[PDB]
Amino acid sequence: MLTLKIFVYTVVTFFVGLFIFGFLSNDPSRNPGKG
Amino acid sequence: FVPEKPMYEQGLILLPHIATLGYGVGPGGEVLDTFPYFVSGVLHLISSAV
Amino acid sequence: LVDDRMNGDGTGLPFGVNDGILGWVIAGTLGTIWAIYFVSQKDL
Amino acid sequence: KLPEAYAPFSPIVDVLPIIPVLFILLAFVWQASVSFR
Amino acid sequence: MTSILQIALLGLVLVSFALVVGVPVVFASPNGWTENKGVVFSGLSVWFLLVFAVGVFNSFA
Amino acid sequence: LVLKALYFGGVYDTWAPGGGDVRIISNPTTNAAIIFGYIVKSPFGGDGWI
Amino acid sequence: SAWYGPDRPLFLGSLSGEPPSYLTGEFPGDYGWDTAGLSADPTTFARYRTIELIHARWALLGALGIITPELLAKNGVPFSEDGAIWFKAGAEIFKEGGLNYLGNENLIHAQSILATLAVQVIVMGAAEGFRANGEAPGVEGLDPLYPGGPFDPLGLADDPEAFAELKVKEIKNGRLAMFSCLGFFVQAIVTGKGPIQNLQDHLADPGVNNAFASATKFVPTP
Amino acid sequence: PDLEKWYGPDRKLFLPGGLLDRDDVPEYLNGELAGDYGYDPLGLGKDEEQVEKYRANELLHARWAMLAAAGIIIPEGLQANGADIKGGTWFETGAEMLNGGTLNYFAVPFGVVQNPLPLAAVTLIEIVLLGAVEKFRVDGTGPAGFSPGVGKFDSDIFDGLDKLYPGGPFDPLNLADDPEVFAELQVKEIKNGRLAMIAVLAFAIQSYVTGEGPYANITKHLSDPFGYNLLTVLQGDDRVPTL
Amino acid sequence: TINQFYGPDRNKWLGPYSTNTPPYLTGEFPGDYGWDTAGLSADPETFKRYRELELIHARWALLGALGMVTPELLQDDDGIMFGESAIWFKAGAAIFQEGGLNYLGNPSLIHAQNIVATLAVQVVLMGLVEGYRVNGGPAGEGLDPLYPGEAFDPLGLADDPEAFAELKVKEIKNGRLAMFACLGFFVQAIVTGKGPIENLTDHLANPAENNAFAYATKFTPQ
Ligand code: CHL
Ligand code: CHL
Ligand code: CLA
Ligand code: CLA
Ligand code: CLA
Ligand code: CLA
Ligand SMILES: CC1=C[C@H](O)CC(C)(C)[C@H]1/C=C/C(C)=C/C=C/C(C)=C/C=C/C=C(C)/C=C/C=C(C)/C=C/C1=C(C)C[C@H](O)CC1(C)C
Ligand SMILES: CC1=C[C@H](O)CC(C)(C)[C@H]1/C=C/C(C)=C/C=C/C(C)=C/C=C/C=C(C)/C=C/C=C(C)/C=C/C1=C(C)C[C@H](O)CC1(C)C
Ligand SMILES: CC1=C(/C=C/C(C)=C\C=C\C(C)=C\C=C\C=C(C)\C=C\C=C(C)\C=C\C2=C(C)CCCC2(C)C)C(C)(C)CCC1
């Protein structure tokens, strides 16, 4: 029954990791402006 | 300050901040003395002026 | 007891971890995304 | 209460908290006196 | 001993009041900080002296 | 705050027998396991994070 | 970070002084740590460089092989208590169950250390002999210290500057792993417990559960 | 190195630039002596030659007070920590040897030596030797040598030197020929001396106020700062509990 | 004279029986008796490095060998000054008793209880001074790495060249004497576990049956 917990914890860490490295990954340069 | 009452009905917020440091606190929680609170306030006021 | 329960509610479990496999797969997923990001860093 | 040596100054003490609120209001007087430059 | 401390505290109140009403005006005065240096030093030295006096008078009062 | 809790004999413990006491703290628990488990746990009523 | 050239980092920081004339910074792992000067002759320098690198690789392999089994033993994998701690792993082959990889009855299950060491001698003698020639069946003649080719299927040795900084990464990680391996041999001699168990007991109370707690174990008696 | 921070027309003052103008310093302080901070509010500085005259008194005073501060802090600390010093507290050390008393030397690490020297002979040798070394200071003549500054120097080495800063036998470690490091160590020495003499005045005042030694003062202050300080020891006892 | 130890006919490691002297050891530097039967000093710059770490080893062995017996010399009849810690190879346990680390039996001296803190201060300070030794700083920078003598020589002494030669071979011989004696210290700690002065007293009581032959049975693998 802990299998559901493992699956949801894995997908939550996956989405959070996408967020963390997406904003670590030179986010302010993703702009059309001169900056 | 009213000394005979427990010290939370007098609308005082930061004398609990000094009293949590135990400065003038009895065994059961009696206030005992108010001079540490007074000297704390005056030192803060002089520091504020400078 | 009448049913099998996780019985981890409370007890001060860090990050809600009660078995080591969950912490290992959390670290594995974060490390996998980190390896992908690191090898594919500097755009190219 | 204050100790015996400081008891007569308690009414002078009893007006302080409004002074920080008067500081931003003094800043408003400043900004109006410079005619909102 | 109580009267000495009370008079010292009253003088300290008046000195701090004078400092409050004077320091910003003297500072923002055009060519005033370089000419009122002596009186500002006198006021600050007196202010600190009365503070230390009330401090040493607490232990006798 | 360390100096006050261990060497200046202050701060009130509410959990002393009889209704608490101002207690000079001896042998504080500084271990990384309990401190970090205190900082990385859930913020709900099961444990409370901080 | 300019790991080559004259401006390379040194083995004592700014207080390093002058690096040796026979070490100008062509090779990875260069910091000028040459207090005794064992590497004066370039041939001797080459032999020591190969020895250092082979030991770096072996130390990295030993580091994972000494950390992973006890981690799995404490993480639900049914290792026996005998083979969970590395210096006693060789004693697991003397038991009735044999050598159970990952605590599995039908996995490996070897009971003849004589034949195990015999095939080990044959296989590793062949491997090291093919290493010594620089020529193997199906492998042409090239650099003996850095073969690549069949040993680099990924193809990360193609680009020069990344290959050089990866050389630096490899030699520095090897030096870290050999610190670790010598440390593990030290705790094995002194503590008699696994290194992860040593760190675990050190985290319980770092004030007393450190290296100073074992200073009086080897003291002689009259 | 870095002599501009202490020497030159622009230097550290007793007040910063926002409160003290650079023209309020009197003319005879232009940044050439050690400790030049421009702090002469009264009429004691007058001119540079009188400044140079008081410089000798100031430097010898600073060194004497520095020796006094060290020889005050060390023996009382040894007495409070367990050493058999027998009179480590500084303002009772003369009361030991009146009738038949003695003293003990704790010369680290091999101290604990019982001194049988009487006070009269001690005072005699002290006054004679200090008078002799003072005459050597003011007139610049020394009978013998064998100093680590230079091996077996003659008597005529003090002539041609500088008063209050003579090189040679008084520099056993040398390292004072270079003017930059010499001036830096000069400013360091004079600031260390004023720190030491302010300390000395504090030890005397705290002695006369609390009646105990200053190491005992600071150890009790660290034992409890609010339960042992200026206002606490000047309060007296108990203090009615003010509700 | 000088030529007794720096000439081509100098003192050797066999006196007049050192016919096959190595060619590179001509007697220029202190010592140079020719005892290089292993031939490990063939290369010149390596011979320089080995000589420098020789003099460093010699000086710190002089400190060690002299400081071995001084607490045991000051040991009294029963030991109020020091208990079991008067012996050299039991000195470290002077930090773990109930009182602290007293230098000469009293709380006024040293009196430390944080071995970790004194370890950190020792490491930082003397690693820094090793950096000064190999690079330079407050004392001197461009001087001889082995023989600076500027701030460390304040008592004259070092000014005369034949005096340099004489009391430099005095250095190397005193250092080697302490070096050999220190080997004696460690091995008598191993084979007996008894202090040097008490072993000396036991031998001078009866040299006949008290010798290392009395402990030759101790290492027998029964
Ligand atoms: C050259 C340095 C050095 C040496 C030889 C020793 C030796 C010793 N210390 Mg020790 N220490 C040294 C430095 C330091 N110690 C300490 C702190 C302590 C403590 C706290 C304690 C000791 C104790 C001991 C003894 C442990 C009993 C034993 O059989 O040990 C192994 C020794 C032998 C088997 C004898 C043969 C020694 C020989 C092989 C050494 C020479 C070669 C070495 C590899 C050294 C190489 C240089 C570097 C690595 C130090 C032992 C004789 C303990 C003690 O006294 O217990 C009664 C103790 O409690 N030491 C510090 C920190 C301040 C040191 C800092 O440098
Ligand atoms: C954990 C508890 C602990 C306690 C209770 C003490 C207690 C003490 N330690 Mg300490 N220590 C402790 C831990 C540690 N000590 C040290 C390292 C030392 C050292 C190295 C020394 C002490 C000393 C002392 C004593 C200092 C008091 C004194 O003499 O005051 C009175 C003295 C002063 C206030 C200042 C005196 C300074 C001294 C250098 C004066 C020199 C004067 C000269 C003119 C110098 C001239 C030199 C050149 C320029 C010409 C004292 C009994 C000292 C001692 O034992 O002295 C006998 C000492 O030398 N400790 C370490 C390692 C970091 C510790 C680690 O835990
Ligand atoms: C035995 C493995 C080994 C070998 C063969 C080498 C070989 C070499 N190293 Mg290297 N090194 C090693 C381990 C090794 N190293 C480790 C563990 C470290 C980290 C401390 C370093 C850090 C290092 C640096 C920073 C540099 C070198 C350099 C060099 C080259 C010249 C130095 C030399 O000739 O010394 C010969 C080495 C030996 C003869 C090994 C002797 C081993 C004995 C048994 C030592 C016994 C005591 C020892 C200190 C262990 C105590 C514990 C320890 C973990 C602290 C040479 C090819 C220089 C270079 O530029 O590389 C090209 C250089 O800058 N090494
Ligand atoms: C983290 C340590 C490390 C690093 C940075 C390198 C780096 C390098 N190695 Mg190398 N190697 C290592 C460890 C390492 N090695 C070990 C331990 C061995 C012994 C098995 C070898 C044996 C070896 C050989 C025979 C050769 C190289 C070669 C090379 C170079 C090109 C290959 C490459 O870029 O692939 C990429 C490297 C990495 C991505 C870093 C490795 C990280 C992996 C993914 C971790 C693996 C651990 C995992 C749990 C599996 C356990 C190990 C198992 C395979 C036994 C390169 C600079 C070739 C060469 O010399 O160049 C011409 C070559 O001939 N290595
Ligand atoms: C580790 C200490 C050490 C070191 C680094 C040196 C180094 C050196 N010695 Mg020296 N020596 C030593 C100890 C040491 N010695 C001691 C204790 C003695 C007294 C017995 C001597 C007596 C001696 C003489 C008479 C001469 C030298 C000479 C030399 C120089 C050339 C010889 C050489 O390279 O051999 C190589 C040395 C090493 C590679 C390091 C030695 C460490 C070994 C490998 C381990 C211990 C050896 C052995 C097991 C000790 C146990 C036996 C013991 C009972 C003696 C060289 C720089 C010759 C010279 O020209 O003077 C400058 C010379 O003639 N030595
Ligand atoms: C008997 C051994 C011995 C001998 C013959 C020498 C000889 C020499 N040393 Mg040397 N030294 C020694 C031991 C020795 N040293 C030790 C053990 C250390 C480490 C502390 C040093 C550290 C050292 C340094 C840093 C320097 C020298 C230098 C020199 C040269 C000139 C200065 C000098 O020391 O004159 C000789 C003086 C004596 C022989 C007097 C020794 C008598 C003592 C006082 C006996 C008492 C011992 C005492 C109990 C030890 C505890 C004291 C401790 C706290 C320091 C000279 C060739 C200088 C140099 O490099 O050459 C230019 C230099 O810079 N030495
Ligand atoms: C450089 C120099 C120079 C200067 O001048 C001088 C001097 C000082 C000499 C120097 C230095 C040196 C050094 C330090 C060296 C060292 C090295 C090392 C440490 C190595 C190791 C190295 C290390 C290594 C290899 C290791 C390895 C390991 C191994 C195999 C292991 C294995 C295993 C495992 C897995 C587990 C199991 O259960 C068991 C076994 C099976 C057993
Ligand atoms: C030359 C040659 C040639 C041929 O052919 C070959 C060959 C053989 C190689 C050779 C030879 C060699 C040799 C002899 C060597 C030796 C070495 C040694 C002696 C070491 C030791 C060495 C040793 C040493 C240093 C020692 C030292 C010591 C010390 C520091 C001590 C310290 C201490 C003290 C004070 C006290 C305390 O309580 C403790 C301590 C703290 C601990
Ligand atoms: C009146 C009275 C009294 C008395 C008192 C006294 C006598 C004293 C005092 C006191 C005090 C005396 C206090 C204080 C304060 C202080 C402060 C407030 C400080 C400060 C400082 C700072 C803030 C700094 C800044 C800076 C600079 C400028 C430099 C560099 C950077 C930095 C940032 C560090 C009492 C309360 C007892 C009681 C009641 C009455």
XYZ file of C-alpha atoms in Angstrom, chain I residues 6 159 183 196:
4
model
C 85.775 17.440 4.519
C 79.915 33.884 11.804
C 64.765 4.083 17.179
C 63.812 3.854 29.290
